[PDB]
Structure formats: C-alpha cells, structure tokens
Amino acid sequence: CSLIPDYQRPEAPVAAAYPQGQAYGQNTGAAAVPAADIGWREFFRDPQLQQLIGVALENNRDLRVAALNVEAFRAQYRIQRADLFPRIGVDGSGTRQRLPGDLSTTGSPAISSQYGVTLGTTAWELDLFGRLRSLRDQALEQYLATEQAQRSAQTTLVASVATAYLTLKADQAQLQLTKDTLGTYQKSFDLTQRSYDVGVASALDLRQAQTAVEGARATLAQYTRLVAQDQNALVLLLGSGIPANLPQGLGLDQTLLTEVPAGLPSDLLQRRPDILEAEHQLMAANASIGAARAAFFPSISLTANAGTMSRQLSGLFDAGSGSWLFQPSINLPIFTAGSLRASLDYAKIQKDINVAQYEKAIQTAFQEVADGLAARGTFTEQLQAQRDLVKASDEYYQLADKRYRTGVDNYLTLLDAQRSLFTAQQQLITDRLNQLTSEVNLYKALGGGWNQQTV
Amino acid sequence: CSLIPDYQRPEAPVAAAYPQGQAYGQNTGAAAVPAADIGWREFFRDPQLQQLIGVALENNRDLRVAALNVEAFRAQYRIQRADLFPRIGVDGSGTRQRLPGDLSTTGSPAISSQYGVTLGTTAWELDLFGRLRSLRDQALEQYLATEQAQRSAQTTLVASVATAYLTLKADQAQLQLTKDTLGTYQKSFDLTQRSYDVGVASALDLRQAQTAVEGARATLAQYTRLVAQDQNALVLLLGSGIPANLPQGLGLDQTLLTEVPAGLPSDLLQRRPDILEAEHQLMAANASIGAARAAFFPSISLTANAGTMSRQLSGLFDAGSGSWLFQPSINLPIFTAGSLRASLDYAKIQKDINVAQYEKAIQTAFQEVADGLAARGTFTEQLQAQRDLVKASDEYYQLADKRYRTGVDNYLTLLDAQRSLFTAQQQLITDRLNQLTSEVNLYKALGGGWNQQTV
Amino acid sequence: CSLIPDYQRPEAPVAAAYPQGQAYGQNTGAAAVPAADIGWREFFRDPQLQQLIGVALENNRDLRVAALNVEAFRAQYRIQRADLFPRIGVDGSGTRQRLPGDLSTTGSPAISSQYGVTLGTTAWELDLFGRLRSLRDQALEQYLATEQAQRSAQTTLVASVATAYLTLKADQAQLQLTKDTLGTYQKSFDLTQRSYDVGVASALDLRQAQTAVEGARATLAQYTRLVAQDQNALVLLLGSGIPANLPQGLGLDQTLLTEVPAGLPSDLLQRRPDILEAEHQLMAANASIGAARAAFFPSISLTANAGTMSRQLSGLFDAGSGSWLFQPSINLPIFTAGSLRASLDYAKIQKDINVAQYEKAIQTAFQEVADGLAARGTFTEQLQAQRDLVKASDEYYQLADKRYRTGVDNYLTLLDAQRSLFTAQQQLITDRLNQLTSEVNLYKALGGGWNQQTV
C-alpha cells in the first residue's frame, strides 16, 4: 500500500515560439537534431580549442566536485535503500542489579546477575505503508537530479573555457594592433623630431607628437596586462596549465563555430539539464508528499531476538539454555495536537515551492535562449556593416598610399590613414569577439555540450 | 516558570541625520506620511507600469517562493506548537519470549506471551521550566522573520520591474534616435555620391562618408539587439509575456514618479522590511537562549497508559482486564563534561551573531538611502545642465537651418548640426534614465512598495 | 584504537614559479620574509589610512560575525568533546502497575508500584574504538578551519577598506580637476559672450560655448554624485563614521605603499588563509572517515545506578534499602544490507570533495597572485608613459602661455591648452588609482593583513 500521489506535469508558462521582432530572424520548426545532441567535438571546429576542452573536462576541479557530489548522493540513496531492510546483528543483554529485601525474589537484599549474548534486530520498523519506500524514492529522485546537475556543470564549464579561449585570441589580436599603432606613432614622432631639428616645425607640434606617442605607450602596456589577465584566467579554468604542443588553431577570420537549430520552447524541457534537474527535485518533493501522508496510518515495528541466556558465564554453552524473543508492535495516533497535519501540509508547501523552482528554471532558460536568438539575429548585420567599414577604410588607406607614392602627399597623412585603418580593425575584433561569446552562450543555454560527438 | 531573557533592542550605529555636503540637499524634518505608506499606485505614474506591476506581482516565481516559504514556516510553527502536547494514540504490543531453565519461573524452559493492546502516550514531556515553549516562540519569530523577508522580496520585485521598464523605454528612445542618425548619414552619403559621380569631390571623402554610414549601421544593429534583450529581460521578470490591452504610456521627460519624503534615519528601524527580518531573527535567538538554558532545570516527564492486557490473544472482553500504567520519569543533569555550558554558550554566541547581523543590515540600509539622497541632490543639477545643453544644441541647429534656407551653407553642414542635436538628445535620455533608476532604488531602500494606501 | 587514516604526500597542482612573459618582470626567487608577516602598519605608509583601518577593525560588523563564528565553533567543539565522558546525573523514576488477575503475581487484580532516586548515568557509550574521539577530532579541525576563515575575512576587510579610501581620494582629485575645467569653460564662455555682444563672433560660436559649458557642468554634477556615493561606501566598510582628528594624509603622487616580495608559489599554501581553511576542512574529512571506519566495530554502552528504591514513599531512605544497577551491552552488526558500507563510501567521497576544494583554492590563489604580478610588471611602464604625457602636455601649456604673455595668440588657445592639460591629469590620476588598487589586491592575494601584535 503505497501513498505517493500520482505525478502531474506542470504546464510551461512560455509561449510556444521564440519571440519575433525587428531584431530576430525567422524561426524554424522542430529540428531533427537539437542543440543538446551535437557534441563539443563537432560544434567546436579548431583543434587547439578541442584539446583545451579535452584537458579541462579532466583536470578542472569544479567538475570533479560535481561528479563526486553525484557519487556522494549514490551513497546517500544507498543509506535509505538499506534502511528499508533490517539490521541483523548481535547484542549483549546484561542486567546485574541490586534490590532491597522487599522487592527481590529471595526476600532479602540480593545481587542478581543474568547476562548472555543474543542475535536479532534492534527495533526494526517494517514498512507496511509506504513511508520508507517514499523516503528512498525521495533519495533516488535527489540522486538523479544531481546527476542531471553534473551535466549542467559540465555545460557551464565547456562554455566558460570556450569564452576564455576566444577572449584570449581576440585580446592578443588587440595587443598586436596596439603594437602596430605604437609603431606608427613612433614613426610620426621620429619625423616631427627630424623636422624640429631642421626648423620647419615649432616645438608645439613636437609636444603634440610626444603626447600622442606616450598615449600609445600607455595603451600598449594596458593591452599587455590584459593578455596576461585573461591568460591567467584560462590557466584557472583549465585546472592544469596550458600544454605546450598545441596545434595551430583557426583564427578569428575563419568560421570557428557551426550552425545550431533553435527549435521549439517545448523542446527545451527535455534537453537542458537545469530544467530536468528542477523537475526531479519536484519529483523528490512529490515523494515527500507520501512520506508525510504515510504517518497517519498504522506504522508497524518488529523486535526479534534469538540467542542463549544464562546466569553464570560458565554455563552458557550447554543444553536447555537456548532462547529467542519475538516482539511485534503496532502504533496508531488517535489524536495528536496537529503535528501530522502540519507535516502533511508542509510537504505540500515544499511540493508547490519546487513547482515554482521548476517553472522559474523554464522562464530563465527561455530568456537566455531568446537572448542568444536576438544576438544571432543582429550580429550578422552588425559584422556585415563593420566589415564594410573595414573595407572602406582600407580603400581610403590604399588611396592615401597611392597619393603618397607619386609625391603629392606627406608621410604623416599616410600614417593618419594607417591609424584610422587600425582603429577600424580594433573595432572589428571586439565585435566578432562579442558575436562568438554570445554564440557560445546560446549553445550553453539551449542544451549545452554534454555528449562528445553527435548522437 | 518561563526562562527566556528580557529583550531591549540594540541602538542604530548610523548617524541621527542623513549626510550633508555639496551633493546632498537640505534635511527634511520628519515624516508625517513615511515612505512605506505610499504605495506603487500612488508612486508610479505610468498606467503601463501599474499594469506591469499588477501582472508581475502575482504572476512571478521568486515572490511566489517567498510567499509560500511564509506558509512553510507557519507549518513548522504548527509542528513546534503541537509538540507541546502528548502523543495520544493506540498501540498493541505483544511479546513472545523463550527463557532458559535458570531464568524461568518454574525452573524449566518454557514460553510466556504478553498480548495486550493499550491506549495512551509514550515518552512525552511537560516543561514547566520553559524549554519547549522557548522553541515554540523561536519558531514563531522565524515565521515573523520570513514574512518580513516576503515583504522585502515583493519590494525588490517592484524595483526590478520598474527599472526594467524604464530601461526599456529609454532603449526605445535610443533606437528611435539611432535610426535618425543613420538617416542623416545615409543622406549625407547620397550627397557625396552625387558629388563624386559628377566630379567635384574626390574618392577620399567618399570613403570617409562610407565609413561613417557603416559605423551608423553597426550601432543601429547594436541598439536593435539591446532593445530585444531588454524586452526578453522584462518577459523574464514579469513571469509571463507583455499582455495585450496596455493603456497609453507617457514619455520619459515628464513626471514619471513623484517625490518621496526621506525623514529621519531612525524610521528605517520600523519601515524597512529587511531590518525587521533581522529584528525577528534576533529575538528568535533570544528564544533559543531561553531554550538552551532550561536544560539545567529538571525535566518532568511521564508515559501515561490505559488499555487491556492479557496473556492470550483472543481475549479482551473481561471486566477485570482494565490495565493501565502511569510511569513518571524525572531526570536532572548535575555535572556533565561541560555539555550544558557549551550549549548555553553557543546559544548566547548565536544571539550576538544576530546583533551584528542586525546592525549590518542597518548600515547597508543607511548606505543605500544615503546614495539615493545623493542622487536626488545631484541629478536635478545634472539634468538641468543637460536640458540647457539640449536647448543650446537645438538653437544651434535652428540657426544652421536658417543659414541653409537662406542659402549660404550647403546641406552637409545642416546634416552635421542635425547629428550634433541627435547626440545631445541621446545623452539627455541616458541621464534621465539614470535619474529614474536611482530614484526607484531610493524608494526601494526607504520603505518599499508593500501596501497600497493608508491604514 | 584510532582509525583516522594517514595524511597524504602533497603534490603541487601548479608550476613551481610565477609565470614569465612580456607583462611579467622577473622572478625574485625565494624570500626570507614572506608577505604574511608584513602587517598593515609597516605596509600602509599613509597614517590616515592606518587610523581608518584601525576604525574598520574595531568597528565593522563582518569581523564581529567572523570572530563570533570562531567562538560558536569553540562551543560546538566543547559540546561534541563532552560526549566521551559519562553524563552522570541524579534522576527520579517510578511505575504504577495495573495488571489483571491473570497477570498478577498474587492472583487478584491489584495495584503495584516501584519507584526510586538513583545517582547514575543513562545509556552512556564507552568509546572503545574511537568514534566520538573521531567526531571531536572533526570538530577540532573544523574549529581551526573557522579560525582561518576569520583570518581570511580580516585580510579581505583590510583590502576593501584600503581600496575604498583610495578611490575616495582619487575621486576627490577627479572632482577638483573637473571643477577647474568648468572654471576654464565658464571663462571661455564669458570671453565668447563679450565677443558676441561686441559683434565679432556670430551666435553659432556662442552656441558652441554653451554646449561646452553645459557638458562640463553635467560632468561636475556627475563627479559630485560619485564622490558622495564612494564616501558612503567607505562609511559602510568602516561601520563607523570618519573620525574628526585625522592626521594629514599623503597624496597619490608619492609612495603610499611599497612593493611586497612575492616569492615562490610554495609558501602560498602555508601563508594564505583560505588555503589553510580548505586544508583543515580536508583534515575534518579525514576524521569523518575515521569515525565511519570505526562504525564497523562493536560499540559498548553502559548505564549505572547508585541510589535507593522501595515501594513506599515514607520509607525509601531507611537503612538496607539501597539499590544498584549495572547494564553492559556489546553491540555489533553483521547484516546491514549496504548501509554502513554506504556511509563509509560517503565519508570517503567527502574526503575527495574536500581534496578537490583545497586544490581549487590553491588554483584561485595562484591565479589572483599572478594577476597581481602582471599588474606590478605593467603599471610601472604604463605610469611612466602617463607621466611623460602629463609632462609633455605641461611643456605644451608653458609654450602656449608664453605665446599668450608675449601677445601672439589670444586667451582662447590658452584655455584650449588648459583643457588638454586637465584631461591629461584626469587619465594620470585614474591610472595611478588602478595601479594602487591592484597593488592592494595583490597584497590581499598573498594573504598578509592579519598580524599587528607579536607572533
């Protein structure tokens, strides 16, 4: 006679399609393969980043805490599963007592000493009504909830290592462009110091060129420390240090990522691990309903023992000294003060709070995926505009070079065209860094990379 | 006799007046109508914002978690109140035992059955020294603490919906200005393309106009993204989507929300919810002192019982079989190994943990209110300087338009003046967003939006 | 017998030296005096900041919570250490029997009773195989973990008050320079208003003068707001107000601090506090697996009595009415169905979890220290570039002042030169702020805010 109630799936409050507008693109229907099935070996193309994630899934320690928390709750489920069963041990019953002359058996103050070992249960409570069954069911639901949360931890780790590597590549490209702008400012100050010695340029243009060079040196040192900062952050996120023999990974100009189907908002309820973690927390509260409801009914205990008793220790292995104890007990609360109804509606409160936790998880997951959809809809237009800016600034540089080569234009204006080209490329690097990090965050938000390859 | 210690509250470490200087305003005297009295309908002037609070206030999930955690701790208080009273029920306790020949009555190994069903209690205590009653009002004051926590959760919900809606309107106005800057850049590029196709302008300023247009299209894609992400954030924070029948929402430069009287710093000790939460955790710590003190005094307990006992199982109809037990049980710990000093010491240490927690909540409340007062004091000067900036740039554009319409300058300088006026309007909208965000956080920090009208 | 397993030979999860690159200067090798025995009075040369740290230590409330948590775990260690020693305490027992005539010892249904007062113990277990010994060892090592957590809280509080005071003083300097820029713009607007009222400059130059002045007055109000917010944040981090009798502090130009020798990565895990509290949580997990391994063994328990009993109230303290009870019990389980095995596995997994958290703590310490070393290596050459920029703009301003005093250029070009000099000093002051706040963060990351008294 089990008393866990019938499970009822809570409805999702999310509308059945991802939101439309001027910033989004056109959605598709159901996908043959969702995002939670293409692994981090196919979605991540370049070999260096695949080797870094293959290192960081093993050497990092937060994923190790996640997997060990899973195996800890294996042990914690095994506790309750064995608590459903007896504990067949021994015990030693020894009562050496002194009573007055009125209370004893001899009519005199006497020291009586009966002591002898015996095996059997120590108040083993048998489970007629399903309260121990529902406690181990709660333990099993908590176990597989946390082994869904381990997949959620691996998802966040793969996304964080990917964003750390992409910011490392983009920030060392920024460092190279600031080094090149420092080179052009140094050449312009060299020419202004040359024209200052001869006498064409006054000392005001010399001080202006010197302020420009010192600003470029400050920018160069700041990007040097930023490369050091996010390289140390990647050393943290890999667990171990960066290995030496990494392959020549693909730069930012190639297609570093693959296309991912968005799908339906109702498809997300079975694939993202945070959703299906909060769902099994809700099933654990569903088992706690039965754990609190199975207190109203008669709980049955057993106390059995079997072993030899004696008076002296010397005559404990002989004939006629066998013994055995059998003691059942039933128990039924006629009128408590309201602790059982308080435990029942407290379990119902925990059930509805975990309903709210599951539904909040669906809402935040839908918001993160709609964030990723809006960014994937707008960054293609932003980077098309930015690459047209880079191409127009490069054509302006080539025309300033073509005016310089024939002689009608100075070298300082050619260096101004070089620095406007480098400002255009420094903007392009950061816009593509924002595109790639939001693409990785969208892949995390849909189903994440838990499988290694496509299944 | 009860044993809970008497409680006077700790005084506030923060000053008796809000800070003064060049940033703040003059101090108001007191509050006849304080800040927590004014509801969100007599504070928020948008009917759209009133409808969005009316949706989000009962259709959220985290506020639902708080409002059900209140019910959870009422269930825990019902547990602790019901454990004052005995466990009056029915039980049937049979013992079948084998005894060896030395321990039996007749001297021969035989059996002896004790099959008797009884009614009554097992091991309940009455504490006339005040241990269970101190645990009872500890549970009561944890309930009062978490209902104050529920009020603070609704307060932060109201502040977050208001800030998300104000940033949504500000990003709408940002997008409507970025479309016009893109219009003026595209029109200036069409003029330079016509000037290039005839032959007046070179290719260099044509590439400059192309880079300007592509910068405008990049920032247009960025603001479409940012508007879509802000709508997704407000879909998260309402709980459901934006509903259908929204009324008219007024502008951003009008009176979006009325002024709030600040009052004294001591009025936070009664109006603010989180300070009252720390207050009730402090008096629950005093109740826990009274519980962990009352174990020195002797506990009086008894296991009352009344039933029908017999050797045989089939019989209880006899008139003489009205069996009953009384069994009182009184204990007294006279000298342990310093267990009870350690328990009383740990409870007193928890009390002056919660003292420090209480005045740390006071100090963070005072800091949030003082930053809100500084924002009130400085944003009037900043926003008036910003409106004078916008008036100056508007008059400059009007004079450039008069200069163009008479015929002296061309249309490119008119488009440059128009872009300067658009940049001034953009910075005005950002500063007004900052003012409204800081005053919503000030209203959140003073007393919050709990009730609607007066009591 | 004790069953706590042996401690393991430590492997390093880190390279044996701080990294090298363009940012990193050069390793200093090992150090004689580490970074933890440099107290905050021989490190912070600023006497005003030293009194501010003194107020922040004897007045803030997070240190009250931390030191009171250490006191709470002293009480918890005593309440778990006291479980070895026998809880002896005089008590009072009694029964009042109603057995029927089938069950009575005489043959008629009668009333029987047996009561008495006995000095003795109740269900005391003798810790023969070290389970409660292992639990008090666990409580002792969690006490040491709580003490190292208090040391970590104190060094982070010293760092936070140093950085808050430092940003306060730097934003005082920022407010003073933007008040000077507002002065120069107001004087340039006075000159342009005269040059308009006479007739030379048109109204468009007057509108550029107004847009400059209103931009500057907006930024002046913004920095008054920001100084007020940062001073209220410093009031939060102190817990008490700024005291009145402060000495004259040192400005940001001269050395407020000195460089602390970093050393090797091998004395982090001896000097840093959070690594040590992770180490003591690991030791507590070793004691937990000691108790779990001792759980297989037989757990002997005892009761005892030395008092008197009788059946009558008026004669229980007569001669020869003494009583005495001895109750030994050897108890070992044989069949546990995988419960004690499961709790053993759960404690081994707690050991592995605390190993992983200790190793994570070493990795986060190494990452934060390496970021501090990056900042120390780069901010020197960046600040040299910034000071050369300020000196070149100051020479440019001296040349523009010579051109003004002779009579070649008007006063508006000198105000343009002051506009450039002031923003040069703006960027210099915020860069020196970044250097000093990252130096304080490195000093926290090596873990040296603890000692003021002797060792």
PDB file of N, CA and C in Angstrom, chain B residues 120-147:
ATOM      1  N   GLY B 120      -2.844   5.349  24.968  1.00  0.00           N
ATOM      2  CA  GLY B 120      -2.150   6.332  25.769  1.00  0.00           C
ATOM      3  C   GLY B 120      -0.930   6.862  25.054  1.00  0.00           C
ATOM      4  N   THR B 121       0.022   7.345  25.848  1.00  0.00           N
ATOM      5  CA  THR B 121       1.170   8.089  25.358  1.00  0.00           C
ATOM      6  C   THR B 121       2.448   7.301  25.601  1.00  0.00           C
ATOM      7  N   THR B 122       3.497   7.659  24.864  1.00  0.00           N
ATOM      8  CA  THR B 122       4.828   7.086  25.047  1.00  0.00           C
ATOM      9  C   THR B 122       5.844   8.217  25.043  1.00  0.00           C
ATOM     10  N   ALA B 123       6.409   8.501  26.221  1.00  0.00           N
ATOM     11  CA  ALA B 123       7.578   9.364  26.414  1.00  0.00           C
ATOM     12  C   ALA B 123       7.331  10.798  25.939  1.00  0.00           C
ATOM     13  N   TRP B 124       6.309  11.420  26.512  1.00  0.00           N
ATOM     14  CA  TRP B 124       6.091  12.840  26.298  1.00  0.00           C
ATOM     15  C   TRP B 124       6.540  13.600  27.535  1.00  0.00           C
ATOM     16  N   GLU B 125       6.894  14.862  27.338  1.00  0.00           N
ATOM     17  CA  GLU B 125       7.376  15.688  28.429  1.00  0.00           C
ATOM     18  C   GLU B 125       6.554  16.964  28.528  1.00  0.00           C
ATOM     19  N   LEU B 126       6.366  17.421  29.757  1.00  0.00           N
ATOM     20  CA  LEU B 126       5.899  18.770  30.027  1.00  0.00           C
ATOM     21  C   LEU B 126       7.074  19.541  30.602  1.00  0.00           C
ATOM     22  N   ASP B 127       7.321  20.719  30.072  1.00  0.00           N
ATOM     23  CA  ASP B 127       8.434  21.525  30.544  1.00  0.00           C
ATOM     24  C   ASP B 127       7.830  22.760  31.187  1.00  0.00           C
ATOM     25  N   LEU B 128       7.693  22.722  32.508  1.00  0.00           N
ATOM     26  CA  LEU B 128       7.260  23.892  33.254  1.00  0.00           C
ATOM     27  C   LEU B 128       8.408  24.847  33.553  1.00  0.00           C
ATOM     28  N   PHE B 129       9.593  24.598  32.993  1.00  0.00           N
ATOM     29  CA  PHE B 129      10.730  25.493  33.112  1.00  0.00           C
ATOM     30  C   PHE B 129      11.016  26.273  31.836  1.00  0.00           C
ATOM     31  N   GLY B 130      10.318  25.984  30.747  1.00  0.00           N
ATOM     32  CA  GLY B 130      10.326  26.842  29.586  1.00  0.00           C
ATOM     33  C   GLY B 130      11.286  26.485  28.480  1.00  0.00           C
ATOM     34  N   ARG B 131      11.465  25.202  28.179  1.00  0.00           N
ATOM     35  CA  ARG B 131      12.332  24.791  27.083  1.00  0.00           C
ATOM     36  C   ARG B 131      11.552  24.628  25.783  1.00  0.00           C
ATOM     37  N   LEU B 132      10.474  23.841  25.819  1.00  0.00           N
ATOM     38  CA  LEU B 132       9.659  23.647  24.626  1.00  0.00           C
ATOM     39  C   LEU B 132       8.907  24.914  24.246  1.00  0.00           C
ATOM     40  N   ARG B 133       8.542  25.739  25.227  1.00  0.00           N
ATOM     41  CA  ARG B 133       7.882  27.000  24.913  1.00  0.00           C
ATOM     42  C   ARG B 133       8.855  28.002  24.306  1.00  0.00           C
ATOM     43  N   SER B 134      10.128  27.931  24.693  1.00  0.00           N
ATOM     44  CA  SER B 134      11.129  28.771  24.049  1.00  0.00           C
ATOM     45  C   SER B 134      11.426  28.299  22.629  1.00  0.00           C
ATOM     46  N   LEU B 135      11.397  26.984  22.378  1.00  0.00           N
ATOM     47  CA  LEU B 135      11.473  26.526  20.990  1.00  0.00           C
ATOM     48  C   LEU B 135      10.229  26.917  20.192  1.00  0.00           C
ATOM     49  N   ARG B 136       9.069  26.968  20.856  1.00  0.00           N
ATOM     50  CA  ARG B 136       7.827  27.367  20.201  1.00  0.00           C
ATOM     51  C   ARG B 136       7.891  28.814  19.730  1.00  0.00           C
ATOM     52  N   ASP B 137       8.273  29.735  20.616  1.00  0.00           N
ATOM     53  CA  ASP B 137       8.302  31.105  20.114  1.00  0.00           C
ATOM     54  C   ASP B 137       9.572  31.421  19.327  1.00  0.00           C
ATOM     55  N   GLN B 138      10.591  30.552  19.364  1.00  0.00           N
ATOM     56  CA  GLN B 138      11.638  30.616  18.346  1.00  0.00           C
ATOM     57  C   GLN B 138      11.076  30.334  16.954  1.00  0.00           C
ATOM     58  N   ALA B 139      10.239  29.296  16.832  1.00  0.00           N
ATOM     59  CA  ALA B 139       9.594  29.015  15.548  1.00  0.00           C
ATOM     60  C   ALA B 139       8.652  30.144  15.137  1.00  0.00           C
ATOM     61  N   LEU B 140       7.966  30.747  16.117  1.00  0.00           N
ATOM     62  CA  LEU B 140       7.081  31.883  15.850  1.00  0.00           C
ATOM     63  C   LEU B 140       7.855  33.076  15.300  1.00  0.00           C
ATOM     64  N   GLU B 141       9.014  33.365  15.879  1.00  0.00           N
ATOM     65  CA  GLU B 141       9.766  34.523  15.432  1.00  0.00           C
ATOM     66  C   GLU B 141      10.558  34.256  14.159  1.00  0.00           C
ATOM     67  N   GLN B 142      10.868  32.994  13.849  1.00  0.00           N
ATOM     68  CA  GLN B 142      11.342  32.692  12.498  1.00  0.00           C
ATOM     69  C   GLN B 142      10.238  32.881  11.461  1.00  0.00           C
ATOM     70  N   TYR B 143       8.986  32.564  11.821  1.00  0.00           N
ATOM     71  CA  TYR B 143       7.865  32.873  10.931  1.00  0.00           C
ATOM     72  C   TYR B 143       7.721  34.372  10.683  1.00  0.00           C
ATOM     73  N   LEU B 144       7.804  35.188  11.737  1.00  0.00           N
ATOM     74  CA  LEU B 144       7.707  36.638  11.540  1.00  0.00           C
ATOM     75  C   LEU B 144       8.885  37.178  10.727  1.00  0.00           C
ATOM     76  N   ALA B 145      10.080  36.606  10.929  1.00  0.00           N
ATOM     77  CA  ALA B 145      11.248  36.982  10.139  1.00  0.00           C
ATOM     78  C   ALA B 145      11.041  36.693   8.657  1.00  0.00           C
ATOM     79  N   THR B 146      10.506  35.521   8.324  1.00  0.00           N
ATOM     80  CA  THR B 146      10.345  35.246   6.903  1.00  0.00           C
ATOM     81  C   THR B 146       9.124  35.909   6.283  1.00  0.00           C
ATOM     82  N   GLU B 147       8.139  36.354   7.070  1.00  0.00           N
ATOM     83  CA  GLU B 147       7.118  37.171   6.416  1.00  0.00           C
ATOM     84  C   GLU B 147       7.634  38.585   6.146  1.00  0.00           C
TER      85      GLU B 147
END
